Every structure is written in structure tokens, then in C-alpha cells.
Coordinates of C-alpha atoms in Angstrom, one line a residue:
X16 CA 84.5 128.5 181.4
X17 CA 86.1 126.3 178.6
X18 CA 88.2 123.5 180.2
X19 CA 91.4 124.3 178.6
X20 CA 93.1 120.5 177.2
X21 CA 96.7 120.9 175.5
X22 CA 98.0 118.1 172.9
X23 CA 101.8 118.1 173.6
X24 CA 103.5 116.5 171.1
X25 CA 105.9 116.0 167.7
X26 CA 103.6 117.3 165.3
X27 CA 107.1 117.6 162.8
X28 CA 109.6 115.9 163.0
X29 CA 111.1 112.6 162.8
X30 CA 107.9 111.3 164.5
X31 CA 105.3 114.1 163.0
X32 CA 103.2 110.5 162.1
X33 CA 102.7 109.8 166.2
X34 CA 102.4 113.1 166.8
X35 CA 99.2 113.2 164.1
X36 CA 97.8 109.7 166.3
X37 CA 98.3 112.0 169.2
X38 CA 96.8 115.0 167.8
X39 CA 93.4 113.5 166.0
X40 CA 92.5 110.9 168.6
X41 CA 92.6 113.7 171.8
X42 CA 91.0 116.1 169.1
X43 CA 88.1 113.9 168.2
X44 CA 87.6 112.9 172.0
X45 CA 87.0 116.4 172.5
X46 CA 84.9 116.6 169.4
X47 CA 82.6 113.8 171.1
X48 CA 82.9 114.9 174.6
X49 CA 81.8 118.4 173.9
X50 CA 78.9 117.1 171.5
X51 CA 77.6 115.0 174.7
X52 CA 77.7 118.0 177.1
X53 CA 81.1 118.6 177.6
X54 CA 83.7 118.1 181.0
X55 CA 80.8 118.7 183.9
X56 CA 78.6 121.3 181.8
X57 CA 82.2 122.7 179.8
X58 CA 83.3 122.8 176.5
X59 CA 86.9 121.6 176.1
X60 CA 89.2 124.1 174.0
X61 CA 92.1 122.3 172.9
X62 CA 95.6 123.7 172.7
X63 CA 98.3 122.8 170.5
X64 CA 102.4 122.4 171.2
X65 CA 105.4 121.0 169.1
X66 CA 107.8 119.6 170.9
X67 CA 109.2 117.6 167.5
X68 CA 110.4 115.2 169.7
X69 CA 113.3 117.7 171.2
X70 CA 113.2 117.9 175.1
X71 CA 114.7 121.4 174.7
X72 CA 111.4 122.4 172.9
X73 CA 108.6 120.1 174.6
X74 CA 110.3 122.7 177.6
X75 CA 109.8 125.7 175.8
X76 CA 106.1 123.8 174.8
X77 CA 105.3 123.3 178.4
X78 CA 105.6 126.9 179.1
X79 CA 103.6 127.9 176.5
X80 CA 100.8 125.9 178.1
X81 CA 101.2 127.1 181.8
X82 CA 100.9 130.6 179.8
X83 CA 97.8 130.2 178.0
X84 CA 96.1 128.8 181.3
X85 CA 96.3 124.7 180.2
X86 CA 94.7 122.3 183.1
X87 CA 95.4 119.1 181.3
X88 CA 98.1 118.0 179.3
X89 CA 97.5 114.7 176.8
X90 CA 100.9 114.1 175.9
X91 CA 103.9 114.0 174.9
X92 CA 105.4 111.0 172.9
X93 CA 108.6 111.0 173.7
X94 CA 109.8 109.8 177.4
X95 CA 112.5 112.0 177.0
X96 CA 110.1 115.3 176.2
X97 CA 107.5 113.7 179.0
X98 CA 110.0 113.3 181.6
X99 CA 111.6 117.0 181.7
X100 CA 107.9 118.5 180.8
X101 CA 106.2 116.6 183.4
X102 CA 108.3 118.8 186.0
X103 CA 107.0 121.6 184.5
X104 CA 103.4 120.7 185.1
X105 CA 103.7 119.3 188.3
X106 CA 104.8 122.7 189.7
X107 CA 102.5 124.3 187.5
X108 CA 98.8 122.8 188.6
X109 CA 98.9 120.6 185.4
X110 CA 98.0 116.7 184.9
X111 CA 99.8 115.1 182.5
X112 CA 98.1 111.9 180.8
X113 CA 100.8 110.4 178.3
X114 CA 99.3 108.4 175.7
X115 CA 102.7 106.6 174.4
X116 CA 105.3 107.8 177.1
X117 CA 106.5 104.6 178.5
X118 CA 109.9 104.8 180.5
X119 CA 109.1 103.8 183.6
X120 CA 111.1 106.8 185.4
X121 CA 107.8 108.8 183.7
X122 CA 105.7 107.6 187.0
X123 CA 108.4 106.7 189.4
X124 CA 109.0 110.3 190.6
X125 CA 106.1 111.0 193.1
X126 CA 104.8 113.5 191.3
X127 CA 100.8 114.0 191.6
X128 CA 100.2 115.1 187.9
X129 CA 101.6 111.9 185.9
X130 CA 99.4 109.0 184.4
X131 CA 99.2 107.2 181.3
X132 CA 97.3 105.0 179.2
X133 CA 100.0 102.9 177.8
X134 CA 102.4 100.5 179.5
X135 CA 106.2 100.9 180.6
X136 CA 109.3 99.6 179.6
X137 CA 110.1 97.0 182.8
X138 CA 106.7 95.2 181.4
X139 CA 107.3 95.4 177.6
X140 CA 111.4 94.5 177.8
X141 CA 109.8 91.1 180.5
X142 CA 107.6 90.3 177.3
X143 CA 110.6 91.1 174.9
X144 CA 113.5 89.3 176.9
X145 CA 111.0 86.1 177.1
X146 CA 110.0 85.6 173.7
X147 CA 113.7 86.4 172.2
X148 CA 114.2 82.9 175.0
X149 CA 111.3 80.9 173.9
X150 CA 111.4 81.7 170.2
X151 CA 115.0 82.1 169.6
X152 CA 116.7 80.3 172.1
X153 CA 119.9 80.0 170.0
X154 CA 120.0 83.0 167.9
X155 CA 123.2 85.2 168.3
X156 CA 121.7 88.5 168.9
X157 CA 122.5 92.0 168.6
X158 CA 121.0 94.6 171.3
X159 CA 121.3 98.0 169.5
X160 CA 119.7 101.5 171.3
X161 CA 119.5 105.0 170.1
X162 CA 121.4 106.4 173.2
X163 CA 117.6 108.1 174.9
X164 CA 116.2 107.3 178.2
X165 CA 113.4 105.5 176.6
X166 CA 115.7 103.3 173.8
X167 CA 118.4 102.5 176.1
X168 CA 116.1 101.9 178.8
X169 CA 113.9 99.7 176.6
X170 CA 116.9 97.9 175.4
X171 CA 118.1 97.1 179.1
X172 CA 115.2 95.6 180.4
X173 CA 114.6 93.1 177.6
X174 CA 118.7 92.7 177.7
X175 CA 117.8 91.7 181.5
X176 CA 114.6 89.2 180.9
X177 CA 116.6 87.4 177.7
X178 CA 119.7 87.3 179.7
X179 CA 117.6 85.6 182.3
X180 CA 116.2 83.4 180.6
X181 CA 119.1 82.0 178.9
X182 CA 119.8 84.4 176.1
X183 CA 123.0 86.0 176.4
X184 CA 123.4 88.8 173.7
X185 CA 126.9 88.4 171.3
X186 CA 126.5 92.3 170.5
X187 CA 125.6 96.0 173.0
X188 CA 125.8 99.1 171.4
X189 CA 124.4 102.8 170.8
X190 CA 123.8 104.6 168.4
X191 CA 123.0 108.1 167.9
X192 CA 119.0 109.2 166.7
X193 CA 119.5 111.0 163.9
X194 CA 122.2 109.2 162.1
X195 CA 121.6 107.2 159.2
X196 CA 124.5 105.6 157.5
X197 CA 124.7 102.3 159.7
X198 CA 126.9 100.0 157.2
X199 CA 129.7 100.1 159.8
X200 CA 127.2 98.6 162.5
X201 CA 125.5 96.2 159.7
X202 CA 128.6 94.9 158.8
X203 CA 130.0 94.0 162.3
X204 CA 126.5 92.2 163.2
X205 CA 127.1 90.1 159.8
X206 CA 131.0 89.6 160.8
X207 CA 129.7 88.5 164.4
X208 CA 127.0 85.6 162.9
X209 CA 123.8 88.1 163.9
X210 CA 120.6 86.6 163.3
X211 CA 118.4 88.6 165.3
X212 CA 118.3 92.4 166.1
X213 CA 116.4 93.9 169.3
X214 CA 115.9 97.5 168.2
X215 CA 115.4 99.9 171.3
X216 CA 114.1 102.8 169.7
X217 CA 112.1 104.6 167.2
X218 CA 110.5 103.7 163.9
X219 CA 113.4 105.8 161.9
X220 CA 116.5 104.1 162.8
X221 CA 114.6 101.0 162.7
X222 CA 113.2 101.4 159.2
X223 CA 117.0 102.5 158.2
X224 CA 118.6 99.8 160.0
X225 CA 116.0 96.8 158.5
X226 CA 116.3 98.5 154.9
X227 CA 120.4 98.8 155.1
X228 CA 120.9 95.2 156.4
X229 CA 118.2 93.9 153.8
X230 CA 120.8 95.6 151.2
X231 CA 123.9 94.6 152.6
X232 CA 122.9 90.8 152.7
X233 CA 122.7 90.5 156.5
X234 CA 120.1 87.9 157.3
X235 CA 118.5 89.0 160.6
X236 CA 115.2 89.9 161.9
X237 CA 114.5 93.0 163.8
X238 CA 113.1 92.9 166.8
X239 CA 111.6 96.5 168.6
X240 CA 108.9 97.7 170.6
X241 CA 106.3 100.4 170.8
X242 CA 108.5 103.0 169.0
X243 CA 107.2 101.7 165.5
X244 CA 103.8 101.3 165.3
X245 CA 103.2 103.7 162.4
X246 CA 103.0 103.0 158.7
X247 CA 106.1 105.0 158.0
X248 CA 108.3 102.3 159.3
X249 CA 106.9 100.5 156.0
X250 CA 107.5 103.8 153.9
X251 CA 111.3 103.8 155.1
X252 CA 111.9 100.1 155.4
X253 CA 110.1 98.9 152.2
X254 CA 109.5 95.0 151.4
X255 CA 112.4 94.5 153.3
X256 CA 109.7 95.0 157.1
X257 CA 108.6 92.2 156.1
X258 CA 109.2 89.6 159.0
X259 CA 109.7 92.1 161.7
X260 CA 108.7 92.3 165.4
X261 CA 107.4 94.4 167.9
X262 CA 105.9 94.5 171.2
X263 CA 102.6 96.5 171.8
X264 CA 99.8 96.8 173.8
X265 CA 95.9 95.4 172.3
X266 CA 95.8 97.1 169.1
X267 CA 92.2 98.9 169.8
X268 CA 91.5 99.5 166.8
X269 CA 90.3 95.8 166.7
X270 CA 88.0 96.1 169.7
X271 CA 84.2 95.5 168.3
X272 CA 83.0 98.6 170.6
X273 CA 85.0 101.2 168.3
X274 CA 83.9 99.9 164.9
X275 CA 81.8 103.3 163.9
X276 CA 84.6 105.5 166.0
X277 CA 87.3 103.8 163.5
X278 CA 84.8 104.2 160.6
X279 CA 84.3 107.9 161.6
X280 CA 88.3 108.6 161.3
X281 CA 88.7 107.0 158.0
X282 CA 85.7 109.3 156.4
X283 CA 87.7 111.8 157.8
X284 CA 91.1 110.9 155.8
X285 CA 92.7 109.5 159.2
X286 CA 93.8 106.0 159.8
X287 CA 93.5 105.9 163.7
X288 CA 96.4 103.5 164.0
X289 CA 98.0 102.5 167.6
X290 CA 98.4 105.5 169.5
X291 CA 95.2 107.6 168.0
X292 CA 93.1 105.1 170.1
X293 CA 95.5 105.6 173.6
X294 CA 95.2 109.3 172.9
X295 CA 91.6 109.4 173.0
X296 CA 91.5 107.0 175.9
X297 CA 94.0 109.9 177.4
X298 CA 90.9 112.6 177.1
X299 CA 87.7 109.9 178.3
X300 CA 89.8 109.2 181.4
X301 CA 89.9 112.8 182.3
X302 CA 86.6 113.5 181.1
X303 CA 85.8 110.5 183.2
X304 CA 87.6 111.5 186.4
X305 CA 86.2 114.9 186.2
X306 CA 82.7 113.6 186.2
X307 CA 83.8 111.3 189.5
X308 CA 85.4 113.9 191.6
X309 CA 82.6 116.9 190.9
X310 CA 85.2 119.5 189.5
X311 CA 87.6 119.7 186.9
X312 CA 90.5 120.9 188.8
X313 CA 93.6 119.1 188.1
X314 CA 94.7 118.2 191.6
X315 CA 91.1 116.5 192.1
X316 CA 91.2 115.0 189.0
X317 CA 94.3 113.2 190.0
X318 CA 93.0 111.7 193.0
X319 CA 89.6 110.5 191.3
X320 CA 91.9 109.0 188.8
X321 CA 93.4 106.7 191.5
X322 CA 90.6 105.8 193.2
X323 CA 87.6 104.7 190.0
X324 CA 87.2 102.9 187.2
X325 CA 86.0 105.0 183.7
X326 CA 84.9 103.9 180.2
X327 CA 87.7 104.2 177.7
X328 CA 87.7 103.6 173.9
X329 CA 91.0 101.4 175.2
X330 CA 88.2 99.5 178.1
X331 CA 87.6 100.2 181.4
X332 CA 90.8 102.2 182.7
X333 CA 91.6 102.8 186.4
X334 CA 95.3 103.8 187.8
X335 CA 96.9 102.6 190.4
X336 CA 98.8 104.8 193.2
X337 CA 101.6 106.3 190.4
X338 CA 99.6 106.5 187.7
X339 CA 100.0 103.5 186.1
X340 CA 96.7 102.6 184.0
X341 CA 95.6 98.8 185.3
X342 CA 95.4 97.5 180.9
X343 CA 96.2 94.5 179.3
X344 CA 99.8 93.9 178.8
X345 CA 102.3 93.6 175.7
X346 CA 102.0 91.2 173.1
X347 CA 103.9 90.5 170.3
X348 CA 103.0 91.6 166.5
X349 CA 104.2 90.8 163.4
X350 CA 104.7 92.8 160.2
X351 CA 103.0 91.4 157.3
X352 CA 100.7 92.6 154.8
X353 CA 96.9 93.3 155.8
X354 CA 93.8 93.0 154.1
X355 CA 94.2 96.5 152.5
X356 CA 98.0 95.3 151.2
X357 CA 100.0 97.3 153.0
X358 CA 102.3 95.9 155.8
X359 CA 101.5 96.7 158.8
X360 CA 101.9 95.3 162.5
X361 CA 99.4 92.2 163.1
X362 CA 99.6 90.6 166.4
X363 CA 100.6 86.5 166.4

């Protein structure tokens, strides 16, 4: 009987370009995984669900995949779809593996179903909060959010490491995802001397944000996370992304052992940039665990998760007792252009 595999994510959307890294790297793990034997002697079917980054519908998603008998969930992006879906699964016999998820509430619930193959928020804003310390010690900086669990969250915990470490931040606010007229906030950072802008959020508001101050003459640099690793940041933000940083994990891409994997995207019109890689990782690990604990149920799957080590186009993954994958940690990238000329996120 197939092993039934769901991709939960926002396949339209504001962040329809993650939810394609999400989408093609799980598919293509399947792709290989089947073409080597499958998950124990099964073929993996893989299942589809929108949640276009709106925890209303990754809910209506999640039941939609408790329905068509799903076992595994890779997914979703969004913290905010993760968190509220997770709940779903966990009473519902269903592992969840996010591939980009990284609040750290995500795993810090007790559920037996959650694990990732990304990092959290408490790790990434430490990384952040330092480097805005070491590198901009002086800077008057503005820490803006988009208002969600993850951006706010993301914002506070490199607010708590700079504050730490001797940057104190001249500027807090929210704003709302989805809006997109932000003179009013531009102009009060350039009124207030703002040379440096930590973004916690996503690539939209970011891209708005660094094209609007770019236009309204404020100097500063945006600083975000792991919400804008995707070329459209570039599309929205134009030359003006030049400059820009962002914390994210090894860009695997990069990693000798998945030269003819990347290859293999590109011939077939996919650029497997950041997540696509984390997604696929998401679909060895359980393939992997499977193969460890003798069955492909999802309860068992769990606890051979937490207890070995598996292959992973990411490395070697294991999880520690919340289902937390044991990775290398954040770094910072810069956005400049690559070899191809387009600018994209190169790590310093």
C-alpha cells in the first residue's frame, strides 16, 4: 500500500515562490525514493494542499489530509499555518516535518508529531542581535515586524541579543502583512536618523519596504531573516536589494554532494533555491526513519527520528527530544549579484 506523503503549503499566494521550493524538492525526493525502491518496499503517493499562507485555510488543508488518509505531512511554511495545523495532525496520527517553519513555539508544545529541518527563531535572532552589535555597533536602528507569531517573534529575539549586546533599538513597531503603502513608516525612520532596518518578516513587505525607502531617500540597510530567501524579493525590490541582509542556514545548494541533484532541477526549469533543498531533506529523513524503525507508521517514525542519524541532501540529520534537527546554525548572507547576474543571497 502507497505511503501516502502530503506537501502542505502556499502554493498561491503572497509566498506561492516558497511554496514551489516546498513543492518540487518533497516531489523530487519522492521521485528518487520511489525509483530506489520506495519507503520499506512502498511507493510514496504525494498529496497536495494550499494553505496560501492563511492559517484559516492550512486548517481547512489539514483536514483535507486526515480525509484522504495522509501519514506524513512535509510542511507548511508559515509558523503561523504550522502551529494551528500541527494540532490537527497530532490528534490525527500524522508527523509533521516543516521544512522552513521556524518559531520556536512549532516544537515547544510536547506534541509527538513535530520536527523540522530548519532552525528556530531563538537561534537565528542570537545570530541576528550579535552581528547588528559587532558590525553596527553605532547604528540607530529600526526593529519593524509584520504583527505574526513568526515576524514579531523573530523580531524579539534579535531585539533581545542586540539589546544585549549593547545595541539599543531608537525605533519598535508593527506593521500589518498585506499592506503596502509604508511612506508614513519610511519617513519616521528618516526623521528618527535610521540607518539600519531589522525586517522580521516575509520577503513582500521587505521587498516593498527596501524599494519605498530606496525612493524616498532614506539611507538604510535592511536587515531580515529566513523569510526572504527567494528571487522575488529581487523582482519586488529591484537594484535597490542591493546591500541587504539576512540570516539563513548553509545554503545546500552549495554542498559538493548535490551537484547532479541541483543539475537535475535546473533541466527541469527549477532553480532549487533555499528551501527546495530543506524540503527534500524533509522526505529522506522520513524515508530514512522508516527504514530504522521497520514500519512506516507515523508514531514509530517519530521515535526512530529521535533516537538515529539519516543521510540528507542537507547532511547527516538526527533530532533531538522535540524535534529539533541537530544542523549547522545561521549565518549571515549578503545580497549581491551572482555569477548568473541576478542578485541573489551570498553568504559573507
Amino acid at each position: 500500500m502507497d505511503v501516502v506523503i502530503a506537501v502542505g503549503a502556499p502554493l498561491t499566494g503572497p509566498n506561492a515562490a516558497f511554496g514551489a521550493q516546498i513543492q518540487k524538492g518533497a516531489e523530487q525526493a519522492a521521485k528518487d525514493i520511489n525509483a530506489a525502491g520506495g519507503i520499506n518496499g512502498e511507493q510514496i503517493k504525494i498529496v497536495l494542499g494550499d494553505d496560501v499562507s492563511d492559517p484559516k485555510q492550512g486548517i481547512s488543508v489539514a483536514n483535507k489530509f486526515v480525509a484522504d488518509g495522509v501519514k506524513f505531512v512535509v510542511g507548511h511554511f508559515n509558523s503561523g499555518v504550522s502551529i494551528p495545523a500541527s494540532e490537527v495532525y497530532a490528534e490525527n496520527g500524522i508527523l509533521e516535518i516543516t521544512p522552513a517553519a521556524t518559531n520556536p513555539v512549532f516544537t515547544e508544545r510536547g506534541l509527538w508529531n513535530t520536527f523540522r529541518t530548519c532552525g528556530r527563531d531563538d537561534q537565528q535572532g542570537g545570530i541576528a542581535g550579535k552581528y547588528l552589535a559587532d558590525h553596527f555597533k553605532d547604528a540607530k536602528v529600526a526593529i519593524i515586524h509584520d504583527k505574526t507569531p513568526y515576524g514579531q517573534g523573530l523580531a524579539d529575539e534579535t531585539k533581545k541579543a542586540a539589546n544585549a549586546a549593547g545595541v539599543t533599538e531608537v525605533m519598535y513597531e508593527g506593521v500589518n502583512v498585506g499592506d503596502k503603502d509604508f511612506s508614513a513608516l519610511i519617513s519616521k525612520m528618516k526623521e528618527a536618523g535610521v540607518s539600519i532596518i531589522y525586517w522580521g518578516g516575509l520577503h513582500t513587505e521587505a521587498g516593498l519596504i527596501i524599494r519605498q525607502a530606496a525612493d524616498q531617500g532614506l539611507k538604510a540597510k535592511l536587515v531580515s531573516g529566513d523569510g526572504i530567501v527567494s528571487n522575488e524579493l529581487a523582482s519586488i525590490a529591484g537594484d535597490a536589494v542591493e546591500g541587504t541582509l539576512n540570516t539563513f542556514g548553509p545554503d545546500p545548494t552549495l554542498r559538493p554532494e548535490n551537484k547532479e541533484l541541483v543539475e537535475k532541477f535546473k533541466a527541469a526549469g527549477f532553480n532549487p533555491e533555499a528551501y527546495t533543498l530543506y524540503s527534500y531533506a524533509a522526505m529522506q529523513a522520513i524515508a530514512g526513519a522508516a527504514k530504522a524503525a521497520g514500519s512506516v507508521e507515523p508514531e514509530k517514525v517519530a521515535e526512530a527520528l529521535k533516537k538515529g542519524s539519516f543521510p540528507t541532501a542537507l547532511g547527516e540529520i538526527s533530532f533531538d527530544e522535540k524535534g529539533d534537527p541537530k544542523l549547522p546554525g545561521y549565518v549571515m548572507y549578503e545580497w549581491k549579484k551572482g555569477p548568473d547576474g541576478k542578485f541573489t543571497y551570498i553568504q559573507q
